[PDB]
Amino acid sequence: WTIEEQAKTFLDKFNHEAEDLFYQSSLASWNYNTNITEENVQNMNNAGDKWSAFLKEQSTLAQMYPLQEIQNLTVKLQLQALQQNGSSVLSEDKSKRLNTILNTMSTIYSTGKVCNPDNPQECLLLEPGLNEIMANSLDYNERLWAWESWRSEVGKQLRPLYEEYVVLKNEMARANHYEDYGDYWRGDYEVNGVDGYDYSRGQLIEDVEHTFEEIKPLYEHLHAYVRAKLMNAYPSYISPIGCLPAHLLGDMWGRFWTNLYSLTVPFGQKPNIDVTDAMVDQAWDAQRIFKEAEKFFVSVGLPNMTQGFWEYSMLTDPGNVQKAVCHPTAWDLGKGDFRILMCTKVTMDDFLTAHHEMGHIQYDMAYAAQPFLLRNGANEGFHEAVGEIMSLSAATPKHLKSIGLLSPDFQEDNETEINFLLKQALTIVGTLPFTYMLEKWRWMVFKGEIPKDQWMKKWWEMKREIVGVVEPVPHDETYCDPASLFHVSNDYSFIRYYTRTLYQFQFQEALCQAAKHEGPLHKCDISNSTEAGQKLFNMLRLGKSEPWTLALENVVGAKNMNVRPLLNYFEPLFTWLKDQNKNSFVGWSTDWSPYA
Amino acid sequence: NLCPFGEVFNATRFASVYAWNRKRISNCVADYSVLYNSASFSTFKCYGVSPTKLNDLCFTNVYADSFVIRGDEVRQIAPGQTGKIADYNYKLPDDFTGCVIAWNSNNLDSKVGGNYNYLYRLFRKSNLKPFERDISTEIYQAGSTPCNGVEGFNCYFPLQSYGFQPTNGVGYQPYRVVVLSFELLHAPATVCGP
Ligand SMILES: *[C@@H]1O[C@H](CO)[C@@H](O)[C@H](O)[C@H]1NC(C)=O
Ligand SMILES: *[C@@H]1O[C@H](CO)[C@@H](O)[C@H](O)[C@H]1NC(C)=O
Ligand SMILES: *[C@@H]1O[C@H](CO)[C@@H](O)[C@H](O)[C@H]1NC(C)=O
Ligand SMILES: *[C@@H]1O[C@H](CO)[C@@H](O)[C@H](O)[C@H]1NC(C)=O
Ligand SMILES: *[C@@H]1O[C@H](CO)[C@@H](O)[C@H](O)[C@H]1NC(C)=O
């Protein structure tokens, strides 16, 4: 009975006790997110309290096994996850206050309505009503109305809540021996016991800033190219040297520029590489989308979805009999219960999101047999990357023609090729400055670097400088625009989508090399390749049992995040854009403003 | 004079696997073919014989062990297996001749909120020898510091609850198990096929 052996047994106890408490918290959350009510808020709060009190008792015991006397790597990793006491290091009042704040923000976010001014009772939710305006409208004033109403009438409700959330979350983080909540979040990437594979929380910030420097030129030129195109889409409204107005970017925040494809398509006379129209003509519904994503995975040697996944998931809007949070989420409840929550519409966007969310489930299924504490992505960027690897293949014209969403005599040109890359960039390259800047703002707020009466000042400064984007209306410190986005008001880390976006290409490189793919990385579709399926799975099945730096090296040969594979995926488009822009302004002045 | 298999296979309540029930069967006719087809069993595996072959056979006694476990654990009710159930709860011998039968009991043995009445033994200081049954409640001492009948540090109560919720995946759902041993002693065969 060495210490290691005593810890092994203790964890044996833990895994078995933990499984039910966690599952009951998951179920309680599921009811709330599918059916928002005070009764379901109370049950969620009760199940989460049980879970947290269980975790607290368990962690204080785990810390009675000194890690210094522990050689088993995977044992050491489990006791490392119980090294901090978690969310229960807050008083009962503060903890109940924090939950109130979290529930209120999430409820406000998926329940708040703005009413039309011409019709004082034709009300619209963010999803679908406002999102539809922000994805399809070509009217400056309609888009300005939806963008401003959301932030004015809902984001203002969130402002004082967010303030106290920061205070409370930082105390939680300080009590867990971090500097602030933002440092706490960055710990997801920390690696400690392993020599030549360590990674500190400070190296993340450095690696993100350093890596972002190499993405700027691609982004500068994509920026300049859409901005010239928007000039004709909104006569009078676009400065040739200014930032883009934030309400014209194709969704509520410009987090993705995908919906600008119809305005920026480089070669419009060619077959439509945007299969949204094609899948409405063929009567596709949500089920067809998800059964097609399932066909894609078993094509590479991975499993069907479970029967419980099909019987218990919510794959479409329930109607107005329930108030649900429609933001696509992949749920691993425990005990082999896997669900997706999604309000699926018949759109290429939702087609690809279906593959990506299923990808995360596929990950969850592959490490279900790992011990509870290691049932997780190697890091948050891994976990958000798997799905996107899949959609890189599922989005290619080759793949789209094979599932019958392009003509069977569709022909690939150097022009259809550029159309595709352009659309891919709108999504993938567009989101990077958006993603970096949002987290930098949150990191700065958590670090105490922005006085509260400067929050919205610095937010829009950072938008103008890093992102090339400018508010169409001046915003007071009564506003809380960061919170008008799901992840900010639902308390999720955001840099995952940055690191995730670099990983996904590093991985695609390795998967395509496995599948023997021939030419450039953007023509690759791993469908039907079990050798690719297998290489992916052997990383999925590991969960967090290996530090992410080694898990990454095992698949791609690098112990660190790397921007070169993404840059090279886009090289053809980069050289094109630079030619396209030879007569346009490139770069942006931050002084111009839509309003004067 | 047919054998009371119903009493066993169709009982409303089943034992926990740590305290598995054994029913002695004797002086009766047993149609093992009608059993194989009397329902859809997820598992019906015979080891020293076959079902059609058993209606040709006579035995002194038949023993029917029954209990509930997780699906992902039914693979342990077989000779030569290891793991929590085979090691600490129910051990078939290596030379086992007899049948293992199991079916999904999610609809009888799950409950919203969860049914926790079924237990399994989590810890033991050594392995059950075949067909032993351990209903002891002594604290398991994970070290040399003695427990003295109370839970605590390195001191664990050895029996734990399954949690059966109707939404669990198949591996986590309850399965009902029946194990049939066939005893031949130097005495009259009293249980035969037709
Ligand atoms: C929604 O929640 C309430 C309790 O808060 C419950 O009574 C109702 O049946 C639920 N509706 C659905 C569709 O689950
Ligand atoms: C929680 O963590 C702190 C700091 O490690 C520790 O001092 C304390 O004893 C732990 N348990 C409880 C109930 O606070
Ligand atoms: C780690 O521990 C597990 C058992 O918990 C063992 O199977 C594995 O081989 C060990 N590896 C190392 C490096 O300790
Ligand atoms: C292979 O992929 C093609 C499309 O590229 C598809 O039509 C075909 O059915 C797939 N074959 C198998 C065996 O999955
Ligand atoms: C269990 O009950 C059903 C319904 O009465 C019956 O048909 C079946 O044969 C029974 N099973 C056994 C093994 O007796």
Numbering used by the authors:
A (entry chain A): 19 to 614
B (entry chain B): 334 to 527
Lines quoted from the article behind this entry:
SARS-CoV-2 recognizes, via its spike receptor-binding domain (S-RBD), human angiotensin-converting enzyme 2 (ACE2) to initiate infection. Previous studies have shown that the human angiotensin-converting enzyme 2 (ACE2) is a functional cellular receptor for SARS-CoV-2.2,13 ACE2 is a type I trans-membrane protein with a large N-terminal ecto-domain, which can be further divided into a peptidase domain (PD) possessing the carboxypeptidase activity and a collectrin-like domain (CLD) mediating ACE2 homodimerization. Several structural and functional studies have shown that the specific binding of SARS-CoV-2 to ACE2 is mediated by the receptor-binding domain of the viral S protein (S-RBD) directly engaging the PD domain of the receptor. Since the viral recognition of human ACE2 is a key event in SARS-CoV-2 infection, the soluble ecto-domain protein of ACE2 can in turn function as a decoy by competing against the viral engagement of ACE2 on the cell surface and consequently inhibiting virus entry.
Guided by the results of our initial SPR screening, the ACE2 mutations of S19W, T27W, and N330Y were further combined in pairs or simultaneously in the context of ACE2/active-site-mutant (H374A, H378A, and E402A), which was observed to also slightly benefit SARS-CoV-2 S-RBD binding. The determined affinities were 10.1 ± 1.2 nM, 13.6 ± 1.8 nM, 76.7 ± 10.3 nM, and 19.3 ± 0.9 nM for ACE2[W19/Y330], ACE2[W27/Y330], ACE2[W19/W27], and ACE2[W19/W27/Y330], respectively. For W19, the residue was observed to interact with K458, Y473, Q474, A475, G476 in S-RBD and to provide a total of 52 vdw contacts, outnumbering S19 by about sevenfold, which only engaged A475, G476 with 7 vdw contacts. For Y330, the amino acid was shown to make 16 vdw contacts and one H-bond with P499 in S-RBD. Along the binding interface, W19 was located on one terminal side and Y330 on the opposite side. Sterically, Y330 and W19/W27 were distantly located from each other and devoid of any steric interference. W19 and W27, however, were observed to orient their side-chains toward each other, leading to strong steric conflicts. Our structures unexpectedly showed an ACE2 molecule trapped in a closed conformation in complex with the viral ligand. Because ACE2[W19/Y330] and ACE2[W27/Y330] also contained the active-site residue mutations (H374A, H378A, and E402A) and were therefore inert in catalysis, we postulated that a substrate-like peptide was accidentally captured in the cleft during expression, locking the receptor in the closed conformation. The determined IC50 were 1.21, 1.52, and 2.04 μg/ml for ACE2[W19/Y330], ACE2[W27/Y330], and ACE2[W19/W27/Y330], respectively.
